[PDB]
């Protein structure tokens, strides 16, 4: 940290006293070389060491004329290495200076929007496109409907915005097409019903009519936006009833790809663990859960201390991880397999344990409810070798759901 | 039983315990045993107001990951397990000060 | 004394296995013609080995498969042929990979034995038994890769 | 959108000089009115500019356009081609042809030489180069007497 701060201070001093050199053309000549090197750092690095990056932005806003840095590279480096707020400020300040698959420099806006998605300041996220970048009236009413949390109306309005072909008063741009797809993903995720969410996620990526999954990993856009919604929807479909094991055959090839193993161990421990719990690979699931604990600690340790929303969003998830651990602990013990006692205690603990229902949004309340429902439906099988009230507890627990 | 006749009394003791626990682990281990031994036994309402001070000082354990009978990895995994299994409605209060504006100490020119 | 079993092979199989019981720790074979003689020695069908597949848990029975051309090496594949029924072929995955290349490797009788092996494989992992979870999905496509 | 029609007219008369300016003003026009063209026509405009410049020699501007439409950097890059198939299957030939014709007249940066130095070590690139650019590599080597 002290080295970073010293480098920034000395560089600022050198650049400002270069104005004492004051010869006029070479400064514009050499700020170029500086900015290409600054670009290449983010363009080629693979460690993304945070304080180095924070330094790399620090020079940019101290002086001017260095703010023309490539938005996508610095933004993606920020999402990879965290340290988002300095990137937030850098793009924010770069948007001040007017200038004499997306041509316009407006892409600063969409990069900032993706980055705000990463930090989780969602209100400003609406404010970005409420700030009227990409105007055609129906979008405003769609933002209104989703702001009222009326995702049902927003779904139809977005769908009619996509299927509208008699466009008049001009045309929207494909950046708003991407925004519409992402907003549809979000509002469907707030509405469950993931069958349509699956259909949209699969269709927006690939053609084939029995839906494909394997040709994901074709471009980085696809993975870094559509992979999570896809996997979440398939898991939540599979855990309710039963359907095609395409996700299982999918992860069967996902592991053998070495680079894919890194992403999956980085972001989807819950997913793989619970999916394996379908096929009783409890040994693998236990490994995945201890690894998920590590992933959560590392992620939480990495995030900055001054951001309430990001910390809260990361924190809420541990409630499900602890339950997975508890369930896998309960599965493997013959003293509980053949007896009647522990299930009542477990039900007691679950019935005096629910997330806040005012603090915690639906997108995780539904998750905890669904995991409990699956847990009991699965445990029903092993008890057979009083049993009715287990079926009943789902009713009260979903009454708390509804309330 | 001693912890249900009064709790404010022992809260500072627990606070110092898992505050100094970062330097010498067995105090952290003992305090993070007392936590569940309290939670599973004491009435929820009796302890619920107390959580506003019990958890916030525990965030220090969640700082560094860079990969004797008490180790950092065991206490870290166990404390994550504890702060999760204690309840969402409960661990909501983990922030440095829970739902307050007071904290810009050490963050001013 | 290998010949003192090799030329008396296919004689009284119920007691033709005491030799291997100690020879396997002692003369696992190389050296060409003698290698082929010991191959013909292993050709005797007997129950006397159950855990021996921990030997093939050592790798290099792959390039030796193609050491010398034509009929000499057929007992090597006949090994898997005669122990097919009880297996859980986690390792026949890789063991059949050079067999993918015995289409590239010159032989005709050995290729016929290849095709017989493949014909048994496809029928006998019970291809219509599409179990949702079993690992045989990989060997499905890699076996079809050569069967086609 | 009307100006494209006159550009097609100018290039049909083989008057590539007027078509060049008209296409350039079509690209640099930012006060677009009566709606907007689509990016498919952007790709067509780039390709037509490549063609009409190829019919006009002066490959310095052809090089500048070919390099800029692909990558950012101000000392022009060549190496980050091979990033997408679109780039190779459309822009590679014009690029290599322009650089060769610049280098064979007078002398300039050997960036194409350092470029092909890495082009060979890529196995898949060797196939494309042996498939489509024998004249190019041969004459470029003739500069350095690798007869």
From Swiss-Prot, chain A:
It comes from the Eukaryota. The modification N6-acetyllysine is found at residue 400. Autophosphorylated at two clusters, the T2609 cluster and the S2056 cluster. Autophosphorylation induces a conformational change that leads to remodeling of the DNA-PK complex, requisite for efficient end processing and DNA repair. It is found in: Nucleus; Nucleus, Nucleolus; Cytoplasm, Cytosol. TPR repeats lie at residues 106-134, 135-168. Belongs to the PI3/PI4-kinase family. Serine/threonine-protein kinase that acts as a molecular sensor for DNA damage. Involved in DNA non-homologous end joining (NHEJ) required for double-strand break (DSB) repair and V(D)J recombination. Must be bound to DNA to express its catalytic properties. Promotes processing of hairpin DNA structures in V(D)J recombination by activation of the hairpin endonuclease artemis (DCLRE1C). Recruited by XRCC5 and XRCC6 to DNA ends and is required to (1) protect and align broken ends of DNA, thereby preventing their degradation, (2) and sequester the DSB for repair by NHEJ. It is linked to Immunodeficiency 26 with or without neurologic abnormalities: A form of severe combined immunodeficiency characterized by reduced or absent T and B cells, recurrent candidiasis, and lower respiratory tract infections. Some patients show dysmorphic features, severe growth failure, microcephaly, seizures, and impaired neurological functions. This is DNA-dependent protein kinase catalytic subunit. It comes from Homo sapiens. The gene is PRKDC.
């Amino acid at each position: 940290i002290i080295a970073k701060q010293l480098f920034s201070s000395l560089f600022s001093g050198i650049l400002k006293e270069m104005d004492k050199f004051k010869t006029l053309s070479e400064k514009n000549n050499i700020t170029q070389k500086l900015l290409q090197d600054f670009n290449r750092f983010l363009n080629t690095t693979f460690s993304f060491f945070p304080p180095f990056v924070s330094c790399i932005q620090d020079i940019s806003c101290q002086h001017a004329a260095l703010l023309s840095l490539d938005p996508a590279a610095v933004s993606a480096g920020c999402l990879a290495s965290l340290q988002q707020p300095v990137g937030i400020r850098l793009l924010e300040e770069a948007l001040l200076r007017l200038l004499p698959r997306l041509p316009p420099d407006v892409l600063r806006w969409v990069e900032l929007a993706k980055l705000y998605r990463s930090i989780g300041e969602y209100d400003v996220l609406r404010g970005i496109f409420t700030s009227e970048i990409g105007t055609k009236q129906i979008t405003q009413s769609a933002l209104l409907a989703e702001a009222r949390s009326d995702y049902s109306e927003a779904a139809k309005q977005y769908d009619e915005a996509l299927n509208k072909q008699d466009w008049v008063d001009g045309e929207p741009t494909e950046a708003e097409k991407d925004f519409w797809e992402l907003a549809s993903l979000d509002c469907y995720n707030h509405l469950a019903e993931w069958k349509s969410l699956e259909y949209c996620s699969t269709a927006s990526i690939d053609s084939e009519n029995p839906p494909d999954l394997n040709k994901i990993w074709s471009e980085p856009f696809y993975q870094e936006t559509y992979l999570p919604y896809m996997i979440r929807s398939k898991l939540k479909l599979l855990l309710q009833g039963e359907a095609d094991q395409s996700l299982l055959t999918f992860i069967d090839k996902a592991m053998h790809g070495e680079l894919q193993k890194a992403i999956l161990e980085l972001h989807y421990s819950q997913e793989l663990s619970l999916l394996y719990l379908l096929q009783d690979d409890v040994d693998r699931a236990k490994y995945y859960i201890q690894n998920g604990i590590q992933s959560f600690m590392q992620n939480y340790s990495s995030i900055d201390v001054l951001l309430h929303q990001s910390r809260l969003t990361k924190l809420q998830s541990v409630q499900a991880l602890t339950e997975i651990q508890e369930f896998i602990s309960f599965i493997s013990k013959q003293g509980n397999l053949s007896s009647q006692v522990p299930l009542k205690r477990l039900l007691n603990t679950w019935t005096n344990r629910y997330p806040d229902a005012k603090m915690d949004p639906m997108n995780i309340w539904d998750d905890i409810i669904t995991n409990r429902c699956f847990f009991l439906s699965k445990i029903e099988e092993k008890l057979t070798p009083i049993s009715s009230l287990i079926r009943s507890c789902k009713f009260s627990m979903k009454m708390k759901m509804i309330d | 039983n001693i912890i249900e006749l009064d709790v404010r009394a022992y809260v500072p003791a627990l606070q110092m315990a898992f505050k100094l626990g970062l330097s010498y682990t067995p105090l952290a281990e003992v305090g993070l045993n007392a936590l569940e031994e309290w939670s599973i036994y004491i009435d929820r309402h009796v302890m619920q107001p107390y959580y506003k001070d019990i958890l916030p000082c525990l965030d220090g354990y969640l700082k560094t990951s860079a990969l004797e009978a008490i180790s950092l990895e065991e206490i870290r995994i166990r404390v994550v397990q504890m702060l999760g299994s204690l309840g969402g409605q409960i661990n909501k209060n983990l922030l440095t000060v829970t739902s307050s504006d007071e904290m810009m100490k050490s963050y001013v020119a | 004394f290998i010949v003192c079993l090799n030329k008396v092979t296919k004689s009284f199989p119920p007691l033709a296995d005491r030799f291997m019981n100690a020879v396997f720790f002692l003369l696992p074979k190389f050296h060409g013609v003698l290698k082929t003689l010991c191959l013909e020695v292993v050709l005797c069908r007997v129950e006397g080995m159950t855990e021996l597949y921990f030997q093939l848990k050592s790798k290099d029975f792959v390039q030796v498969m193609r050491h010398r051309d034509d009929e000499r090496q057929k007992v090597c594949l006949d090994i898997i042929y005669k122990m097919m029924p009880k297996l859980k072929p986690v390792e026949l995955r890789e063991l059949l990979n050079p067999v993918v290349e015995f289409v590239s490797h010159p032989s005709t009788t050995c290729r016929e034995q290849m095709y017989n092996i493949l014909m048994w494989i496809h029928d006998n992992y019970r291809d219509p038994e599409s179990e949702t979870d079993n690992d045989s999905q990989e060997i499905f496509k890699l076996a079809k890769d050569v069967l086609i």
